[PDB]
Structures are given as structure tokens and as C-alpha cells.
Nucleic acid binder design. Structure first.
Lengths: 207, 120, 113, 118, 53
RNA sequence: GGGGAGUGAAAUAGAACCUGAAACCGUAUGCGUACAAGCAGUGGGAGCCUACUUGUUAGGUGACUGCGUACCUUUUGUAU
RNA sequence: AACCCACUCCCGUUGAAAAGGUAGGGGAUGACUUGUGGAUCGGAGUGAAAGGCUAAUCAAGCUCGGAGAUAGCUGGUUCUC
RNA sequence: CAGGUGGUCGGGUAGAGAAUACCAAGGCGCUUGAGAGAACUCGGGUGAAGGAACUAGGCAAAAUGGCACCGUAACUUCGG
RNA sequence: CCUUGUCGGGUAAGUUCCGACCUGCACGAAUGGCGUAACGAUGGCGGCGCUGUCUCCACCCGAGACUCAGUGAAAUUGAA
RNA sequence: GAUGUCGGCUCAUCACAUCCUGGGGCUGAAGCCGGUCCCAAGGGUAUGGCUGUUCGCCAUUUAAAGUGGUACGCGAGCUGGGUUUAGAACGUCGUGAGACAGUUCGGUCCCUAUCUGCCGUGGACGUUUGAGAUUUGAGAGGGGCUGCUCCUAGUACGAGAGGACCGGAGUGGACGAACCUCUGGUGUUCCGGUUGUCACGCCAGUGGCAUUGCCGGGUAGCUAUGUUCGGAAAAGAUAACCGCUGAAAGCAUCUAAGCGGGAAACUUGCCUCAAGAUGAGAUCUCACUGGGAACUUGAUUCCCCUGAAGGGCCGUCGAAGACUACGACGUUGAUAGGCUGGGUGUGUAAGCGUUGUGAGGCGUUGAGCUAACCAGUACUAAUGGCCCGUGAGGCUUGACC
């Protein structure tokens, strides 16, 4: 179980003893249960949620009927949460209330798309020398493989292209503040993605 | 100081005037050493009679960097000049007298003698 | 409009009006050895960020013959209070040229009187 | 990577852009309808419209702040006397961009850019 | 860096199995009744029920 | 540059002009091709499509399947 | 500085260029640089000498002949049983 | 065709200058353009903290840069 | 040659450098022997300054790359 | 009818004959240390001075600075210092041209990738009517390192000297991922100062050109050197090793039956991709409920009507991007630009007054200007256009109708 919110940028909190703790603030408009997938009817236990406000003209008839079984009147995206043993009816509303402070949590978003990186930026390679006789290749990868054994490049060779919008989980981030009146998690540190990207906050896998 | 071959001043009374870091002690290849870290120096320039002579491989604590040390709120102290305090084998400072300020990050279990002598 | 309110609830007052070029005395908090006390830090304000809660100011002091710049965080509770000692004429916002001037060359003029 | 980076390079130095854009501003303030490439039309609207907003207020400081960035006497006179009394009650959007086919020699997507009450 | 074998008809044509064309964004003015590109001024200078040039 | 009309026995003899091959490039029709590994064939072989007139035929494709490393020249020897 | 040169890097190497460009570099009133005209030529010139140069050619130019040189070498040698 | 090709003239302001910079008279926009703003590549700009640890080698770069005055070592063929 | 000979200096560390030693494989007096101020786009060592050479690269600016329109090569190639 | 060296750089990949870290046995192992031999390949595994060096010798580190295969890996990836063509010189050999178990200075590194490979990213078709979304996980990849001070405890042990394992934190290093709140870097799209000159008739003001002329700063964005997080714990089946019970072989024996413990190895656990997994899976929801003719009756073909759900073209764009794709929006609209406020940066504009002989000060005035930022606002531009996609989804067999 977890929650779906959007990243509102990073801020800071000073404690009274004087340490500034770096804080990202994950705004969680309250998530609305659409299905409850049971192992009898679906093979596994899970719950679908929704987070608010799509236009009427952007919700298709299949999608509107799915959002009208569950009397939810629902919004951008649909997300899923594998469950162990929890019971949610298909109209319920899970909020930031499933988090306390302290409360180590795992946060996943989509990382910021760097476009088509080179091997220095993508895989932290070394550059060759810039001046000592070096011909045209100052920033290129070096050799790829070995000569005639094997006579081909091994799979998974580190080359260049698209440091992009992959899914990244950042795990064991402490919850600084659960602010349920205006629906906020304040989370210690960095979180993957830009401001306003969708971000999934569920408790820590390494506890 | 922060790197092998960094030249840095000496905040001691009867030793060197310039040392050069030849190694950053600690890990396998530590490339950097800030305030409170332990470098090993060679003495490049010294006074005519004193406890330390020119070209003597010695250990030193870095007390004063111009990259600076950073506090728990994001405040940096940032000196104007790199300086070290030389040390003996059982790492106690050689000089009986310490010049210029040190910072608060240095009063550990081992360098209380430096902060006690400093005019911070 | 959300993170501009997380910020504003922490910015209760600490601060006078000070400019680059001023000489201030900052009263900072220290705690080691089981005590709470104030240590002064007097010098020339050379820089100012004005980023709301993320505001900072650099201040240059020449103590025991060596320079030291401290970039304070303005709304941190370590900066307990602030007081402008004398205030100066600089017609700049960032006085970094004072890092090369040494003695009488690094003196800030008083037209602002 | 140009994340959130406005402006476009148009295969030019910055001084070349500044000359070309205040040329297009002056030519549009005299003719009130010119014909240009669609990206240069998209970037003209960020140069030319603050000049009309500036021209909605007669000051000496406004007419030589207009003059140092549209540097022709005729366009400072066309502003502050014609364009700026006309556009005095319109909150922005003093010019529109209408796509008009493609250039014959290139395929440069063309656009007309037109002052709105012409 | 050259080929060691000339390429056949078949692989030459399979390469260019992708470079066929489209431009179907045409539409008709309700006023004049002529075809023009979408979101573009007409070749007789009209645009959304109004002459503009 | 053509589409006609005329001339001519003939213009797919129209001036780059008799004939007008092959390489190479197209359009049309039939059949086969998007879970299948290699000298591209060959032996087996279903299906489909055309002409016939029907059948124990003729033409065209050839799913699937057994075997299968071009030609030359040089060599003791070459898929090499 | 012009002019003459060509020490270094980088580019260029299917070049803009069959020897260059851009940054820097050497000489720059002389044993200097250069125009125009003339002289020296193939075991023969000229050479502050390197086998340098002699029309993008040089341990003996180019062209035409002897000439279809010679090749114990290489390559090739065409329808059928 | 970024090359080569003898001689003549030569304005303003700054400048020793025919260097150089902005200009006059005069000439020109170098015969593919439009977008876009990845890797990489080229020609540049700035760069925290170190300051030759780079490398075969300070290669490249960075630096120094003028005029007036003061001052200026070894050595020397008495000119440097 | 042995050889990075040995000793001194320079460096934290020096097969290079400078000063000696003399066991000169294999110096030596116009194929000149020893010195030598000044002069080298000369060889080798060290230093100050100086810095993207480097740790370790980040960003930016133009020119290609990429897409669109027009024109339109090449080396190679038994068939695939 | 050419397979271009040694070394360095850049990038690797495997083995295990294991350098560290992990698990053991024996000991001439009291403890800190060791010696040797098994088991283990998961992750790690110096920077430099010299020399062209590989190596080596030193200097200083580290937990450790492993040994090898890969054309002594790697020049259609770089270098070109050594060897090394043409120049010259030394010593030596030769009458000589010249030569070298030799030294020495100098000396051109070409290729736009067709195919396989590899890293990315799409277009087609197929998944059995089609569609919008959400998914399970067969499989695959990533990850896996380690030091120190302390806490029982100066205890167990040891005459003493000395010194623990085993119990658990908290602070580093190297590496990796994300991020930009902070610290800074950049910021030729912002604001100033300034030199030379030219111009806008001129004074003022300002603008071109001088590398952004030079420079001071600096928004957003990107960013490391900045910030945060990570390696786990746990489980299982084991490797040596340690066994219980236990015969064959009245005993003894880990074993032959049968039961256990046991490591960073292996399978999970952690993160990411993943139904082209042709074995193409599963959920929830939506859409289509018209005739006729020919010939051959899974029935196909043709005509008329009808084209839905939705998808696309197109447009405004994006913290998404080479082109794509992805994502958002398209007047029932904040998608971009402008506008209106704020903010941030710069640093007291112009004009006028005032003082001065003038340069220049003082006011007005933290003024003027202000990019990418924040909030609001339909002023401009996103056109109630077209195209695809159809008309209830074969047959056999079984069970319940």
C-alpha cells in the first residue's frame, strides 16, 4: 500500500537546534480507490487508485465507465498497489494519514530526461587526454571489445544513448512532516524527477 | 592540503613555513582532505633553527582550508589560505604554540590540544 | 503557493535592514561541552542572497592576520540576532574585490552617514 | 539540454539576432503586416510587443527607452502616436501570427504577422 | 569502411520500405469553398471565414 | 514534353529517327513471404491460381521436409 | 610591418589545397628580396652538399625509335563426346 | 578552386607606424537554404578547491606585453 | 659494453641532470685536443610565475552532426 | 596481389593456481600475531620520483595493492616516447663504398560503417471482433566493497609483558543512483562600470564594432567539487568442515538406509526491464443489434446504406526529445506567447533642480531596467475539419442451459 502524489519542489526545514534538513514536498491530493483486485477474481491482491481531475472530454467512454462503476468521478492516471492483507472498498479514500513522522519510506518517480548522453555522462567513463598529441577523439569511448576472440561485442556493453525518464526508486527517506490539513508529505532529501511529476510513496522495503 | 602537491602554510611556532602534501591518508585513494583530516607532508621551507628541517617527511592535520568547512545548517566558514599543523608519531602537535584561527570541527578526542592553544 | 507557505511559517522575525558594505556583529549560537552561549562574529557584509527562506549573507573578518568568510543562513536559529555596527557606501551588491585588498585598501567609505 | 530555456538560436550569433529582430520590429511597425518564417515570427512577438506596451505611455524616458531598442526615429514616431494609442485598452496580444504555406526556395514554413486592429 | 558485397535488390528496397510520403492535412473553407492546409491561410488569402491578405 | 488529327505501306520509321539484345530500373496480375537461422539449390511434397477440358494433364508459385560450405587458379592440400 | 621564409601545435588527409589554413614563430640594409631578358642539359648540367634540383618526374629527365628488349618468373588460354 | 602573381596611389580619429581598432571616398553580404539546439567533432568563453599530480617531454594553453623614471648579478673578447 | 659503475648535490622518492673519481670495452691534439663572452625557432636538467595539461571535468557560444526542401559523389562489390 | 610493433591512455571480458574480505582443519596455534592446507570468484584490488619502458628500484599509502587467457585483449578507439626509411655525428670495424653484442639529436599514423556485433530509439504486422486503461511474472539485467574509534572489557587468556573472539551502534573512504533546498561553477538571452572609434543633425542620452571589446556581478536551467540515498537484514538448498543415530564388520565408524548444523559462492529477498513468454497470459470498462445480388455454401466476392468505441493527421507546446516516441492541451480552453501583479538580479535611470570654474558631487531615488521564475488573466494563436477504424465477432468437442 502507498499513495500517489506530485512533487512540488524542494524546500528546507530548520530544527530548533539549528540543523537545516533538506526537504522535498510531495503534494498528495487524496487518492481514490477504483478497484480492489482480489486473488479469487484477479490472481493477486491489489488496489487501484486515482488522483484527481481529468477533463470530461479527455476521459474516454471505457475509462469513464470504469470510473463510474466505482462512484469516484476520477482523474489523471490510474495506479496500482500490491497488498498483503488489506480490505478496501471501491469508493474509499486513502490519504497522507497512512504515514507518521519518522517513518522511513520509499519514493519512486520518473527521473529527469537527459537526452542522449555520452559515455562520460551516462556511464562515468574517463576522457582521454586533451592536448598530448591527441587526435580528434577527446571524449569518445575507448575500445569496445577484444580483438578476434570473441570477434563481437559482448551484450550489455556500456555505450551511449538516453539517460532518460526511466523509473527510479529512492529508498529509505525519512518523513519529516505529515501535513494532513493541506495534504502534504515533507520528505528528507531528494526525489526522482522534476516539479509536478507523478511520484509514488509507499513504505520502506528495507526496514 | 586537499590534494597531493598542494602547498600549504604551517600554523606552528618552531617548524616549517611551507609544507607540501605528498599523500592524503585515510582510504585507498582518497583524493581530498579537508579540515580535521590527516595528510602527510614534505617540508619545503623552514626557519634556520627549529624542530623541523627542510625535506623531512612528516604527518600533519589540516586545520584551515579555503575550500572551507560546512556546518549542519548550510553555512560555510571559508578561510583565506591553506594551513596545516604538524604532528609527531603518536599524533600530538609538535609546536607548543598555534597561530591563527582553527574551527570548531577540530575539537575531537585527539586535537583538543590544538583548539586549546589557538586564538580562535 | 504551497512551498511558499512552508517557507513563510518559519520566517518569524530575526532580522534588521542591512546592506552590502555594512559592518555587522552576528550573535551566533554554539553548543559543545553542555552549554548554550553566544559568540560574536564581526566583519564586513560582502554578499546577500535574498531568496526568502533561502537567504544568505557572506561576511569577511580578518582575525589573527588571516581572512575568514562565513556565509550565514539568515533564518537559521544559529544566527540568534544581528546588529549593523557601521554602514557603508559601496555602490555594489557583491563586494568580492575586498578579497584582494589587504589593509587600508580594504576600508569601506562612509558617504552613507 | 535546454530544460526550460526560452529563446532560439536561429543559426546566428546573439548580436545578429538582436539586429534582425529589431529590424523586423521596425519593418512591422511601418507596414503593419509582414511576411516571414514561422520561427522568426514566434520570436518577433517577444521583441515587438513590449515595444507597443512601452509605447502606451508618453514619457521622454519612455521614448528614448523605446529609441535605444528599436533604433529608428520613424518607429518611435509610429509608436507613441499611432501604436500605443490604438492598443491602449488591449491587454497584450498586439499582433497575430497566421501560417501561410511554405517558401518556394526552401521549405521554410512561412507566416504572416499582423497588427491586430489594422 | 566499405561493403564486402554489393547489396541485393531486395535489401536495397527493404531499406527504403520506410520512405513513403504523407501530407494529408487539407480542409475546405466554408465561405469560399477551396482546399488549403489546416491552420494555414488559404492560397486565395482567406482564413476562418475572413480575408486576411 | 505530350494527347489527337494528318503524311506514309509502316511513326512503338517523328528527326537522339533501320533492327533494337543483355546488364540495370519500373508498373500490372497470379502465388508464396512477419516463431524463422547458412552457397539459396536439389530429391520429396500439400495447398492455391490460371488455361483447358476435366486428368493417372499443361503452365505459374512452392508452405513443409531429407541432402547440401560458389566458380577459378594454384598447390601435398582450399568452403577457405 | 610589408616582403621572404617555414620552427611548433591543431585542423585537413575522399582537402578549399597532389604540400594548405588558423594561431603562434625566424630574417627583415643584406652572404637580402624580387621583376624582365639571357646562359649552362642527361654519365650531362647546377649545387653554402641534401642524392638536392633540372616543368607536380630524378642514384641518371622527357619523348621517339632499336622494340613485339629479355623474363628458367607470374597470370590467362574460348565448343562436344 | 581558402593558393600564387611584378609595379603605382593612399583620407579621418586613436597610434611610433603603411601595426592595429573604428570609419571616409569606394566596394561588398563570399550562388544552397529552413529549422532543431542530442551524443560526438571542430574553433572559442568562463570555471570551485588544488596548481604540472598530466605527459616521452609544461605539448597545448595560461601568462608576460607600452612609455617615462629608478634599479640591475655572475661572467666578458670590454662591444656586451 | 658491463651499467641505473661508485661517491657528492638536487627530490619524499632522480636509469635523466650537475660536480667528481679513473677500471678510457672503444678519447686525444687542423677526419684538430682542450676552454670560451656573445649568438641559436639547437639537445638535456632544475626553478618562479602561470594555468582545464591534470584530479575531473561542468556550463556556455558559434560551425557540423539530426530533421525538412533542392542538387548529388566515393572507395569497395563472386552471389547472398 | 600486406594479418601495420613495444609501451602508455580509454574500455574491458573470462579463469582460479584467492591478494583482501568470508567459512574451516592441523599446528612446534596461551592471546596479538602467525605457518601451512582445504572451501569459496560476490564485490573490491594504490598515487608518485626515475627511465620509452613492460619489468624493476625507491617514496608514501591501503583491507589488499593477486596470478594468468583474451592476435604477449584493445592504433577502420587515441598516442607515437622505444624499435623505427631517407639527415647528421661519436666510438669501433673496413683501403673504400659502407657497416654495427653500439650510442646520439631529428623525423607524414588514411578511411563518410554495407553486413554481423553492441548501445539507444522507432515504423510494420501479429496476439482470433475491435478499443481505453490497469496488470501477473516465464525470463533478463543491475546491485553486492571496506576502514577506524568507541560501547561488555583492560574482561576471558597470559607469572608478567601483552591482548581478545563473540554481543550491537556512528563516523569515514571508494563506488553507484537520484536531486538542486543549501555551498559554489556556468549563465554570449538580465543589469551595471569602462576604453577606442563611428553614428543617431547637435548638447545630453544612447546604439553598432572592437574575442561577449574588456570586465564587475548574476535569474532560470544544467551542474559537482554540493545534498540525499544505497550495498543490507532475513530465508532456503549447500561448499569444505562439525556432527547424531547406525550397521555391513557382537565392536568402532557423519552413511550404507535415515536425520542435522554450516560461507560474501548458489536460489530468493532489494531495484529496473519484462506476454514478439508466437506458450503472444489476466482484469475492469466501452463500442457496434441494416438490406440485396452472383457463384462455389469455414462460405467468399460485389453493390447500397452505415461508418461507432476509439486511433491518427493537424495546431499550441513540455522540466519529453537527434527524427521519433512519450506527455499535456485545442475555445464546453491557462497549452504557449503577450499582459497585470509579485519575485529575483543589478545597483540610486532619464529628465529636472542644486553646488561647483570645470571634472564631478547631492537631492528627487533602493531609482530605473529586469531572460528562461511564481500567481492571475482569453488579449494572440491552438478551426463544433479530414482520414483510418465498422455493422455483434469461424468451426469441432465437452459441461451446465
Amino acid at each position: 500500500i502507498g499513495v500517489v502524489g506530485r512533487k512540488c519542489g524542494m524546500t528546507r526545514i530548520f530544527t530548533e537546534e539549528g540543523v537545516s534538513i533538506p526537504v522535498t514536498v510531495i503534494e498528495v491530493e487524496p487518492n481514490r480507490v477504483t478497484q480492489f483486485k482480489t486473488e479469487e477474481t484477479d490472481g493477486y491482491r491489489a488496489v487501484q487508485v486515482t488522483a484527481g481531475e481529468r477533463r470530461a472530454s479527455r476521459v474516454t467512454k471505457a475509462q469513464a465507465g470504469h470510473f463510474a462503476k466505482a462512484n469516484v468521478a476520477a482523474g489523471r492516471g490510474v495506479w496500482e498497489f500490491r497488498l498483503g492483507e488489506e480490505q478496501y472498498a471501491a469508493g474509499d479514500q486513502i490519504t497522507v494519514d497512512l504515514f507518521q513522522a519518522g517513518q522511513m519510506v520509499d519514493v519512486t518517480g520518473e527521473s529527469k530526461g537527459k537526452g542522449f548522453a555520452g559515455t562520460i555522462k551516462r556511464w562515468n567513463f574517463r576522457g582521454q587526454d586533451n592536448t598530448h598529441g591527441n587526435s580528434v577523439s577527446h571524449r569518445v569511448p575507448g575500445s569496445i571489445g577484444q580483438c578476434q576472440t570473441p570477434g563481437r561485442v559482448f551484450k550489455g556493453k556500456k555505450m551511449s544513448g538516453h539517460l532518460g525518464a526511466e523509473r527510479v526508486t529512492v529508498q529509505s527517506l525519512e518523513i519529516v512532516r505529515v501535513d494532513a490539513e493541506r495534504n502534504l508529505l515533507l520528505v528528507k532529501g531528494a526525489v526522482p524527477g522534476a516539479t509536478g511529476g507523478d511520484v509514488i510513496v509507499r513504505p520502506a522495503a528495507k526496514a | 592540503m586537499i590534494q597531493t602537491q598542494s602547498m600549504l602554510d604551517v600554523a606552528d611556532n618552531s617548524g616549517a613555513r611551507r609544507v607540501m602534501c605528498i599523500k592524503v591518508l585515510g582510504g585507498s585513494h582518497r583524493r581530498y582532505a579537508g579540515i580535521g583530516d590527516i595528510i602527510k607532508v614534505t617540508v619545503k621551507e623552514a626557519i634556520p633553527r627549529g624542530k623541523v628541517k627542510k625535506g623531512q617527511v612528516m604527518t600533519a592535520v589540516v586545520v584551515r582550508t579555503k575550500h572551507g568547512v560546512r556546518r549542519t545548517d548550510g553555512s560555510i566558514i571559508r578561510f583565506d589560505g591553506n594551513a596545516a599543523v604538524l604532528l609527531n608519531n603518536k599524533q600530538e602537535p609538535i609546536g607548543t604554540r598555534i597561530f591563527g584561527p582553527v574551527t570548531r570541527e577540530l575539537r575531537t578526542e585527539k586535537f583538543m590540544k590544538i583548539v586549546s592553544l589557538a586564538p580562535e | 503557493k504551497i512551498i511558499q507557505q512552508i517557507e513563510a511559517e518559519q520566517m518569524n522575525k530575526e532580522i534588521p535592514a542591512f546592506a552590502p558594505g555594512d559592518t555587522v556583529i552576528v550573535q551566533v549560537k554554539v553548543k559543545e561541552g553542555d552549554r548554550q552561549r553566544l559568540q560574536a562574529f564581526e566583519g564586513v557584509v560582502i554578499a546577500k542572497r535574498n531568496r526568502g527562506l533561502n537567504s544568505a549573507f557572506t561576511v569577511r573578518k580578518i582575525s589573527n592576520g588571516v581572512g575568514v568568510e562565513r556565509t550565514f543562513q539568515t533564518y537559521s536559529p544559529i544566527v540568534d540576532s544581528l546588529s549593523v555596527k557601521r554602514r557603508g557606501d559601496v555602490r555594489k551588491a557583491k563586494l568580492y574585490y575586498l578579497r584582494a585588498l589587504s589593509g587600508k585598501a580594504a576600508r569601506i567609505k562612509e558617504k552613507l552617514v | 539540454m535546454r530544460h526550460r530555456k526560452s529563446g532560439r538560436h536561429l543559426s546566428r550569433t546573439s548580436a545578429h539576432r538582436k539586429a534582425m529582430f529589431q529590424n523586423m520590429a521596425v519593418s512591422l511597425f511601418e507596414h503593419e503586416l509582414i511576411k516571414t518564417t514561422l520561427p522568426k515570427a514566434k520570436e518577433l512577438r517577444r521583441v515587438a510587443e513590449p515595444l507597443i506596451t512601452l509605447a502606451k505611455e508618453d514619457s521622454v524616458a519612455n521614448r528614448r527607452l523605446a529609441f535605444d531598442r528599436t533604433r529608428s526615429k520613424a518607429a518611435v514616431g509610429k509608436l507613441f502616436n499611432d501604436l500605443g494609442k490604438r492598443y491602449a485598452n488591449r491587454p497584450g496580444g498586439y499582433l497575430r501570427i497566421l501560417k501561410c504555406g511554405f517558401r518556394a526556395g526552401d521549405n521554410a514554413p512561412m507566416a504572416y504577422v499582423e497588427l491586430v486592429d489594422r | 569502411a566499405v561493403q564486402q558485397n554489393k547489396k541485393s535488390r531486395s535489401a536495397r528496397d527493404m531499406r527504403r520500405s520506410h520512405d513513403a510520403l504523407e501530407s494529408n492535412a487539407l480542409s475546405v473553407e466554408k465561405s469560399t469553398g477551396e482546399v488549403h492546409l489546416r491552420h494555414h491561410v488559404s492560397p486565395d488569402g482567406f482564413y476562418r471565414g475572413r480575408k486576411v491578405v
